[PDB]
């Protein structure tokens, strides 16, 4: 059982573990699928936002959120940290540019972020952020894709799923995604990887993309997507 | 060790002894009082073994003035030969390193006795729950193998869910008394059905009264539909009276 | 909730807060403490249990008044009726000197409500095991009564009680009617009601103190005069 | 806290469930559900309405008083569904932070950033031990400058997304429905039609045709931008419109 | 009808039923775990003794020293937590040397005391009792003073006292040989 | 525990089954944990003894002398009773002690020791001033009776008690302090000389266990509680076992009145000091 | 049976609304000794039975001028409120150049000993304090109970065997306001010596007595210094 | 006196907007809402890194509404990059108050 | 054993603090990495257990990290602990440097650093951290040196050492294949190829298992760089060609 272990979060359980990150990264589990492929040309942030009822308006949260001109994420788990944590990530970025006139390359920014999370994650008195990171972005001619953790830790990754039958989006990823693949196809295969790890029927407003390129991070209106899931099917 | 109140201890041949397994507060412990109380099982003799910790009182049950002055120890057995039921009763905290020597001896003497199930009222942890146990229902039970099969597929059949195995453990949060002693009977290979509710410390009445619902969905040793009668003694459950000067 | 009432930061399983209900039953541990609303005012009373002959004649009173023209009759832990008192004085005073007009008698029940509130919020502190209810008369603001609970909710009433038998003294008001007579009159209603709902088996004995607020003081609050006073109890004293 | 971290998955809103469940929040719902009244938010063409059903439990309680619509800015208008205290308490955290935003700012705040700040709020006191959630449901409505009619549902676990038409309280998920149904069959809700839904749809989850005093009608309209209850009269005069068609 | 566990003896501010601590009487009884000091005051003077125990016979007596100096004409014996009658000692004398600074004069043997137990009074500064009792012996301009300090934190006048390990027995012989009128040697 | 901010923390348990499980998980103890376990429960034993030689009867005092009658006293009160108004009625020879020790109690003022009149032999009286342990209760009545009864003798406990402990429908501030309650065994057909407790009244501790040792053996025994306000060897406290010495316990083994009261002041007065934590 | 789990914490409500550690402190303050306290049209007095070898302890103690106290409880919890009481009137004599009204000072007191019962990490003074005093109105006799609620009382007594005296006091409740200070002492010796067994008598050094007067500023009399009132106390 | 005339209104700015607010809030709302807000703030700070390394303080900044806020205490000297550090144990001392 | 581990600031009856060993057996679960000091230089052989088929390689090293110009580490524990572990290490260089403007040697920062995990592990409601450091580096005191520290502060001097998973064997073997004062950079690289092949038996070296860097003194400079993939893998061929020659030679 080793229960008085599963409950505290600054406890080592006797074989080693933090059973409360664990859990943390259970919620990010059990959290609405997210795709992100980074291609050639640039990147994808294509995610099953849970936005399908009519009643919910579309010019509300939006599961892709820019953090820079260049640099975009999405999320998989709690909305409300996923906000916060943006705001902070706005916050570094900004400090970033005014210390450096420089934007923020996307792997300083995710190390800001992920040593936010691990500050909450180390003391007791709070709960590790039940919310993963997918930060995408753009800098020195290259594509970027990061994955950030509640336990603080961040990893570099060309192709990766989240949320719910995130194990099986990643190996389709695994079957489709091309090292040479580029953009504007990419975002098919985003597409496909969310439709094998969808619930219901695939449609514009079941969905929020986002890409990254030369130009920069954008959200992708429900225009874009719609074509992009006709061209799909 | 079971000593009668008489001279000879009437025999408890083809009977089921009712255990109340010491557990988080006293929810075993308190259904078997109200089992006491409505059958009206009278006291055949104590089974006394220093593994409780003393007490005296009164009858806890005592109806007439006549009964009131009955003295009562922690460990009382009773039985009802209408129903062949026997009712062992503790009224006391357990000590230290003496739980399953109790487990031990109690097992013996139904062993000896002739009592074939030794159904034991129990309660485990509401908490160190898992989501699945938090949703699904506090009542749990525990057959042991020598348990025979028209019971289980009775119980199967009333849809029973059974404590959760943690090869696996008989893991029993906050029983103590019970775990062990579902061992060792499993070990002396006699027939018990170790019925608990997961429940947390403070009013545990109506937990007492849920698990002998829980029973009696089985056993049936009440009409099954105010209708269990509870003990004269349960008063004062919360201590004496506020003071004056307060409130 | 057995393991959801030690705190009361913590919700149970149907989303209940158990450690403010135990504070409203604290209030209802102690003795009745009614308040009738007229068209000229309020009217205050209390079953006030005499605990000894000793204490001198005032001791632990319960009809406050936080103001020159607001009441207060509490029913409850006395300590924290007390402390909800002071914290009204000083929020009417410093409404008084910054506004520069009494604290109307709406505002000074929900800032004492809300501070209630945020005493039953946080699992420093507990929440306040007293209830009491304001009550004030201005020729502009006119007959007013509000009462405040543990879980700090200020709820206007046309008259109300707290307290061991408040809903006995509940439907006794539900019973009378209070918006066609004056406060002389509503006197005696509140007095017969306090004996109506006490129980002399069970409490030896009682003092029932009464108080008022209307345009027959002025717009203040003060204690009912003897006369009156002994009137309204040979009232109660009749029926 | 200041007594710790409670005994349980469960117990404690710091502490993940097997899944990650802060059970806690869930809780909170629940005492939402407790408020025991149901409100129904719709957003129209013209006006942005808040409708819900107002409760006197007793003839001696004020029904002056007792309301569950409140006013934050000129601008915003509210209705709470869930424990009263802590529906006033939010009300007060929403007016303050509107008041901080325009001083800090210099113009009011709009709608979605009210219930943003508010969800920021819920959510820190969602991740610490000292403070829990409140159990009370915002419905913020109001006139944008870009969008115009705005309604925000606003929870406790901090989702401050906005709706085209909101429900909270007990019924939540059958005026959902009967919101959605009316929706799909879009007909250009005017301030009548936006007021007439409403309405109608309390009286049908709830099933019972309101009087004018058992329900509390709050607009918000282009041509009156500032948050505005409805009176008896004009309650009785629509619900008089809803019984004629 | 069922016995019961309850906890009250976990945390200095938490009552008994009856209204008891039972953390201060902890270390009331800690200091009788300690060795006696014999503390006497007559109209003659006052006079310190205790039991001082060496634990072998490498150690050396004169760091185990249980009487000290707090001022010139002020003494205490110590016995219980030694550590923790470090600061109580310390603060006394930190407060007789301020009131030699100021006033210029000699602190009673109660006012310094009484500053001792304020010292002492700050448990649940110390989050736990202190866990050691002294014998403030002082002849002040006032007279012979003996006093007593006590985990409860305040202190108490007396004139014949014996605290630590068979400190009940040191009591009754005391009481069995002194008198009022008896001298400092006697 | 709630050392810092987030420390989770656990409810006391009524039951202790949390400590018993602990105790019944010993399967995988080490020998060293073993071993000093052995030797916790060494210094937790009690020893009966004779201070001829300080050696152990080896033997209880029923089985080793005849009882006709043994009238015990737990708690400072009760000793103080029955060492002022019984021991001028006789000589009350020593006839052993025993020698336990727990967390609140000495080998001996927490003593245990037992006397015998000397001029009648079969009546026995013992001073329990100590405190003894649950573990050590029924070690001391195994020592004490032998686990074999008599059934011939009139077993008479006293033990004090704080009002506080009493419950009572009304405040437990609101009760004649100085009152004392009885427990008495199926064989004893005696007056009990005092109302009888309460129901949801229960005792514990050694008294308890010597009252449900007799009701098991079939001894007439009788257990009085003797509840309080103050435990400080008050004189109305051990004036309220007065009432015992009419009944037939301690009937024939008091001698006057006068006295036992003349010598109970100076017990009362010759006890030490609580140090300064009330007053 | 239940109340174990809400009876020791004093920021936790039981399931019958009630805190448990509250009642304890009052319990406290009973098992304490036995002090009485009244006063006449023109004094306040305060009587208190004391504790053999050693010195006893102060139970009477001058907090200020025209102020006095008597402990009933427990010594460290006593001292903080003294040490308070004797702060607040001193910085009022101070800046307000006003002898501190006692009635003012029961009510701060009140509220110091409220701060904790709802205060997390704190307990309850457990100590009832007898405070005498005079000015401005007379007399002031009052009693704080260790919950923080306090009364006014003509006559009081605090402390264990204390209900006796009280209900000798309530014997002459009346009386008290037309007595000189000497009967008025005497009559607080008798309510003293109610508590003590009826073979004890009062003696000289089981006996402190604080008296604030009109004219009289209070003062704690010793063994000696009671003599006079016991020499011609009836017994 | 200080170094400079805004020394001091920069080293207490944060503690006078803080001053500022709950007097407007005491003034207006009544005594709950700085009471209700100190409570916040204290049980947010009560839970953070130890002072030798650099809080991230996030949760704190969303209940003060300045986490999508810049100025120059942010960019200018960074406490993160600190030139002078003391033992990790003697500054957990001073944070406690032994020191 | 279920007490005196809710805190890690509560003994146990025979003096252990749990919270701490199971910080270590935390250590224990994570990969293997060496360490062996040699007369060029010293190397830290450490094994990437990064074999995704979709992982970006966008970094300067997942196990190795460089301190200062002087200084470079490795990590065996939990990544986001050791970030924050290497990110002070880094910090703790450069103050040092900027007050006496020479670089700190390195037992002064393995000290500083295992100060900040012994302070995380002494004081209640912190977690100690759970990260284990290979530190390596030279200095003008001791010159080339290689220390290893854990996450209750204690830090001892090696020869060749190993932290992470298969420390206990991989230490064995490397005293069993290791002499004082002879070993070579060449020969420490070959031992720790070796040791790696002989514990890491999940699979086979394919070269992006395994992570080795290497420090050197050219021109009086601290030469910290990496083996490429070229050089892992001649070594993996060097090792595996020998192995091969000596099986034959046995028969």
């Given at each position: 059982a080793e229960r008085g272990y599963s409950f505290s979060l600054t406890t080592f359980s006797p074989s080693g573990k933090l059973v409360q990150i664990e859990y943390a990264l259970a919620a990010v589990a059990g959290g609405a699928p ?14 099953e936002?849970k936005?399908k009822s009519?009643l919910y ?19 998989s788990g709690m909305g409300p940290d ?42 007791g008195?709070?709960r590790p952020f039940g919310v993963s ?17 509640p ?10 799923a989240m949320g719910k039958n995130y194990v099986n989006g990643?190996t ?24 094998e790890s969808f619930e219901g029927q695939?449609?514009?407003?079941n ?27 | 060790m079971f000593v009668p109140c008489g001279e000879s201890a009437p025999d408890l041949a083809g009977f089921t002894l009712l255990m109340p397994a010491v557990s988080v507060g006293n929810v075993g412990q308190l259904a078997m009082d109200l089992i006491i109380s409505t059958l009206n099982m009278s006291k055949i003799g104590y089974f006394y073994t220093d593994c409780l910790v003393p007490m005296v009182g009164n009858n806890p049950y005592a109806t007439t003035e006549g009964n009131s002055t009955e003295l009562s120890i922690n460990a009382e057995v009773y039985s009802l030969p209408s129903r062949k039921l026997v009712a062992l009763q503790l009224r006391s905290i357990f000590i230290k390193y003496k739980s399953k020597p109790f487990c031990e001896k109690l097992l013996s003497w139904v062993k000896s006795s002739g009592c074939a199930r030794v159904i034991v009222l129990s309660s485990s942890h509401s908490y160190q729950r898992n989501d699945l146990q938090l949703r699904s229902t506090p009542f749990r039970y525990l057959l042991t193998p020598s348990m025979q099969k028209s019971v289980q597929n009775k119980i199967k059949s009333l849809n029973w869910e059974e404590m959760e195995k943690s090869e696996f453990c008989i893991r029993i949060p906050g029983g103590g008394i019970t775990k062990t002693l579902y061992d060792e009977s499993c070990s002396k290979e006699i027939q018990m059905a170790v019925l608990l509710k997961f429940v947390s410390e403070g009013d545990n009445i109506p937990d007492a009264l849920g698990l002998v619902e829980y029973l009696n969905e089985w056993l049936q040793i009440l009409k099954p539909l105010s209708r269990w009668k509870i003990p004269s003694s349960w008063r004062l459950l919360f201590g004496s009276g506020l ?5 | 909730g057995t393991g959801y009432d030690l705190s009361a930061s913590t919700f149970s399983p149907d989303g209940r807060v158990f450690q403010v209900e135990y504070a409203m039953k604290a209030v209802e541990n ?90 039953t919020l946080?699992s420093?502190?507990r929440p ?21 609970d543990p879980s ?14 408040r809903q ?72 | 806290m200041?007594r710790g971290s409670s005994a349980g998955f469960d117990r404690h809103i710091t502490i993940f469930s097997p899944e990650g469940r802060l059970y806690q929040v869930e809780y909170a719902f629940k005492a939402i559900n407790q408020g025991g009244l149901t409100s129904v ?11 819900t059903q107002?409760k006197?439990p ?23 569904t869930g424990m009263t205290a802590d529906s ?34 819920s959510?820190?006191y969602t991740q610490?031990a000292?403070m829990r959630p409140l159990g009370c449901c ?15 549902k606003?929870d406790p676990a901090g989702y ?6 909101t429900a909270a309280g007990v019924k939540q998920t059958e005026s959902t429905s009967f919101l959605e149904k ?19 749809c309390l009286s049908t989850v709830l099933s019972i ?37 | 009808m069922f016995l019961t566990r309850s906890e009250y003896?976990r ?6 039923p ?169 | 525990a709630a050392?810092?901010?987030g420390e989770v923390v656990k409810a006391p348990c009524r039951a202790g089954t949390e400590d018993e499980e602990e105790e019944e998980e010993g399967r995988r103890e080490?020998?060293?944990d073993?071993?000093?376990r ?96 649950e573990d050590?209760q029924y ?26 402990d009493?419950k009572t429908s ?13 427990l008495?065994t199926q ?9 009888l407790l309460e129901q949801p009244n229960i005792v514990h501790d050694?008294?308890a266990a010597?009252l449900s040792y007799?009701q098991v053996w079939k ?61 | 049976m239940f109340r174990n789990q809400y009876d020791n914490d004093?920021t936790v409500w039981s399931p019958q609304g009630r805190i448990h ?215 | ?99 | 054993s279920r007490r005196y581990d809710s ?11 749990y919270?701490?060993?199971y ?229």
């Open positions: 997210s795709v992100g492929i980074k291609a050639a040309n640039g990147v994808v942030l294509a995610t936002k936005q009519i308006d579309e010019r509300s949260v939006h599961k892709v959120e820019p953090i820079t001109k260049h640099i975009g994420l999405v999320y996923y906000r916060v944590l943006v705001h902070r990530a706005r916050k570094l970025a900004q400090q970033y540019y005014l210390v450096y006139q420089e934007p923020i390359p996307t792997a300083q920014l995710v190390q800001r972020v992920a040593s936010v999370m691990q500050e909450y994650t180390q003391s008195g709070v990171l997918l930060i995408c972005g753009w800098n020195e001619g290259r594509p970027y894709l990061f994955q950030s953790d336990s603080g830790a961040y990893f570099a990754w060309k192709a990766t990643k389709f990823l695994e079957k489709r995604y091309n090292e040479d693949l580029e953009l504007e196809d990419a975002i098919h295969t985003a597409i496909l990887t969310l439709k695939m449609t514009e407003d969905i929020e993309v986002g890409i990254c390129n030369e130009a920069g991070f954008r959200r992708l209106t429900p225009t874009e997507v719609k074509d992009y899931l006709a061209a799909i099917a | 003071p004056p000067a307060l409130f | 102690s003795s009745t403490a009614i308040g009738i609303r007229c068209k000229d005012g309020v009217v205050f009373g209390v079953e006030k249990l005499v605990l000894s002959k000793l204490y001198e004649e005032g001791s632990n009173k319960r009809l406050f008044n936080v103001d020159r023209h607001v009441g207060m009759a509490v029913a409850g832990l006395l300590a924290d009726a007390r402390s909800l008192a002071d914290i009204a004085r000083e929020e009417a005073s410093n409404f008084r000197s910054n506004f520069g007009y009494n604290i109307p008698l709406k505002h000074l029940a929900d800032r004492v409500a809300m501070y209630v509130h945020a005493y946080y420093a502190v306040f095991g007293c209830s009491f209810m304001l009550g004030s008369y201005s020729v502009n603001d006119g007959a007013q009564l509000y009462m405040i700090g909710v200020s709820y206007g009433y046309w008259g109300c009680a707290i307290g061991k038998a006995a003294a509940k439907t006794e008001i539900e019973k009378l009617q209070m918006k066609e007579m004056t406060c002389r009159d509503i006197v005696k209603e509140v007095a017969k009601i306090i004996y109506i709902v006490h129980d002399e088996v069970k409490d030896k004995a009682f003092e029932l103190e009464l108080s008022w607020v209307g345009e027959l003081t002025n717009g203040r609050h003060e204690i009912v005069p003897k006369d009156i006073r002994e009137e309204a109890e040979k009232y109660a004293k009749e029926s | 200041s938010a719709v957003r129209g063409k013209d006006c942005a309405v808040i409708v107002k006197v007793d003839k001696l309680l004020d029904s002056s008083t007792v309301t569950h619509l409140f006013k934050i800015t000129e601008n915003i208008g509210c209705v709470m006033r308490s939010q009300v007060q955290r929403a007016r303050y932070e509107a008041a901080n935003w325009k001083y800090k700012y210099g113009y009011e705040i709009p709608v979605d950033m009210l219930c943003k700040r508010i969800a920021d709020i959510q820190v610490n000292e915002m419905i913020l409505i109001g006139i944008d400058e870009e969008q115009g009619p705005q309604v925000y606003c401050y997304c906005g709706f085209k038409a009316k929706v799909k069959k879009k007909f250009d809700w005017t301030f009548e039609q936006t007021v007439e839904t409403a309405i109608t045709d309101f009087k004018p005093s058992e329900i509390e009608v709050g607009v918000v309209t282009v041509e009156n931008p500032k948050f505005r209850i409805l009176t008896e009269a004009e309650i009785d005069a629509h619900l008089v419109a809803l019984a004629e068609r | 003896d945390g200095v501010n938490t009552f008994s009856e209204g008891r601590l039972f953390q201060v009487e902890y270390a009331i009884e800690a200091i009788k775990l300690g060795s006696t000091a014999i503390g006497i005051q007559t109209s003659e003077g006052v006079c310190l003794a205790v039991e001082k125990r060496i634990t072998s016979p490498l150690m050396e007596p004169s760091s185990i020293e249980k009487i000290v100096e707090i001022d010139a004409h002020i003494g205490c014996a110590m016995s219980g937590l030694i550590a923790d009658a470090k600061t109580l000692i310390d603060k006394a004398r930190v407060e007789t040397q301020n009131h030699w600074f100021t006033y210029n004069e000699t602190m009673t043997v109660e006012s310094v005391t009484q500053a001792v137990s304020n010292l002492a009074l700050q448990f649940g500064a110390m989050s736990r009792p202190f866990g050691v009792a002294l014998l403030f012996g002082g002849v002040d301009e006032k007279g012979p003073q003996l006093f007593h300090m006590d985990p409860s934190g305040t202190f108490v006048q007396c004139d014949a006292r014996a605290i630590g390990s068979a400190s009940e027995g040191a009591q009754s012989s005391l009481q069995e040989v002194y008198h009022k009128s008896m001298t400092l040697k006697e | 050392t810092f901010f080490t020998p060293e073993r071993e000093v052995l030797q916790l429960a060494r210094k937790r034993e009690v020893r009966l003894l004779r201070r001829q030689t300080k050696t152990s009867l080896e033997v209880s005092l029923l089985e080793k002398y005849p009882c006709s009658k043994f009238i015990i006293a737990i708690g400072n009160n009760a000793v103080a009773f029955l060492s002022s108004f019984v021991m001028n009625s006789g000589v009350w020879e020593e006839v052993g002690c025993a020698k336990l020790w727990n967390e609140w109690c000495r080998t001996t003022e927490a003593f245990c020791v037992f006397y015998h009149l000397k001029s009648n032999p079969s009546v026995f009286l013992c001073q329990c001033s100590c405190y003894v342990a050590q070690q001391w009545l195994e020592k004490v009776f032998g686990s074999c009864p008599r059934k011939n003798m009139q077993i008479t406990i006293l033990t004090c008690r704080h009002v506080t009493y009304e405040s437990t501030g609101s009760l004649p302090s100085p009152f004392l309650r009885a008495k064989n004893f057909k005696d007056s009990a000389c005092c109302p050694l008294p010597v007799c001894i007439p025994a009788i257990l009085y509680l003797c509840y309080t306000d103050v435990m400080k060897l008050d004189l109305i406290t051990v004036e309220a076992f007065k009432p015992i010495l009419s009944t037939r316990s301690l009937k024939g083994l008091v001698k006057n009145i006068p006295q036992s009261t003349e010598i109970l002041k100076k017990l009362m007065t010759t006890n030490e000091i609580q140090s300064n934590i009330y007053t | 004093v550690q509250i009642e304890y402190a009052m319990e406290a303050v009973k098992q304490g000794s036995a002090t009485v306290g009244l006063k006449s049209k023109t004094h306040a007095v305060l009587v208190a039975l004391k504790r053999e070898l050693a010195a006893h302890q102060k139970k009477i103690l001058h907090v200020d001028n025209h102020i006095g106290i008597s402990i009933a409880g427990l010594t460290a919890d006593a001292r903080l409120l003294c040490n308070f009481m004797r702060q607040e009137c001193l910085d009022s004599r101070f800046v307000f150049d006003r002898p501190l009204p006692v009635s003012r000072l029961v009510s701060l007191i009140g509220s110091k000993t409220q701060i904790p019962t709802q205060r997390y990490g704190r307990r309850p003074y457990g100590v009832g304090l007898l405070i005498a005093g005079y000015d401005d109105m007379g007399p002031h006799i009052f009693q704080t109970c260790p919950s923080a609620n306090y009364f006014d009382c003509r006559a009081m007594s605090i402390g264990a065997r204390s209900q006796s005296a009280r209900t000798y006091l309530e014997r002459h409740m009346s009386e008290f306001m037309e007595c000189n200070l000497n009967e008025l002492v005497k009559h607080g010796l008798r309510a003293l010596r109610e508590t003590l067994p009826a073979e004890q008598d009062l003696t000289t050094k089981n006996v402190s007595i604080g008296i604030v007067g009109k004219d009289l500023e209070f003062t704690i009399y010793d063994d000696d210094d009671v003599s006079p009132f016991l020499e011609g106390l009836e017994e | 006196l200080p170094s400079h005339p805004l020394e001091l209104s920069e080293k207490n700015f944060q503690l006078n907007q803080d001053k500022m607010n709950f007097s407007t809030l005491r003034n207006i709302q009544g005594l709950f809402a700085p009471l209700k807000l100190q409570m916040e703030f204290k049980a947010v700070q009560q839970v953070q890194r130890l002072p030798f390394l650099s809080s991230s303080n996030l949760s704190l900044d969303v209940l003060r509404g300045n986490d999508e806020t810049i100025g120059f205490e942010d960019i200018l000297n960074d406490p993160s990059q600190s030139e002078v550090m003391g033992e990790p144990h003697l500054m957990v001392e001073y944070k406690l108050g032994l020191l | 805190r890690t600031t509560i003994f146990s009856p025979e003096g252990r603090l919270q701490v060993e910080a270590m057996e935390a250590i224990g679960h994570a990969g293997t990495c060496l360490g062996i000091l040699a007369n060029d230089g010293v190397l830290l052989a450490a094994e990437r257990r990064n074999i995704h088929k979709l992982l970006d390689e966008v970094f300067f090293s997942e196990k190795i990290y460089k301190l200062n110009e002087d200084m470079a580490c490795s990590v065996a524990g939990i990544t986001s602990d050791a970030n924050v572990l290497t990110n002070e290490l880094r910090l703790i260089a450069q103050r040092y440097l900027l007050q006496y403007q020479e670089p700190i040697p390195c037992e002064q920062l393995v000290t500083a650093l295992c100060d900040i995990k012994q302070a995380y592990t002494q004081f209640g409601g912190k977690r100690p951290f759970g990260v284990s450091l290979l530190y390596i580096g030279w200095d003008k005191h001791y010159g080339f040196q290689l220390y290893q520290s854990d996450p209750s502060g204690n830090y001892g001097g090696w020869k060749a050492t190993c932290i992470g998973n298969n420390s206990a064997a991989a230490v064995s073997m490397l005293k069993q294949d290791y002499k004082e004062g002879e070993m070579t950079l060449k020969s420490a690289l070959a031992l720790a190829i070796k040791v790696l092949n002989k514990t890491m038996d999940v699979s086979k070296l394919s070269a992006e298992k395994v992570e080795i860097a290497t420090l050197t003194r050219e021109n009086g400079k601290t030469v910290i760089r990496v083996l490429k993939q070229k050089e892992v893998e001649q070594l993996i061929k060097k090792h595996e060609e020998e192995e091969a020659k000596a099986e034959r030679e046995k028969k």
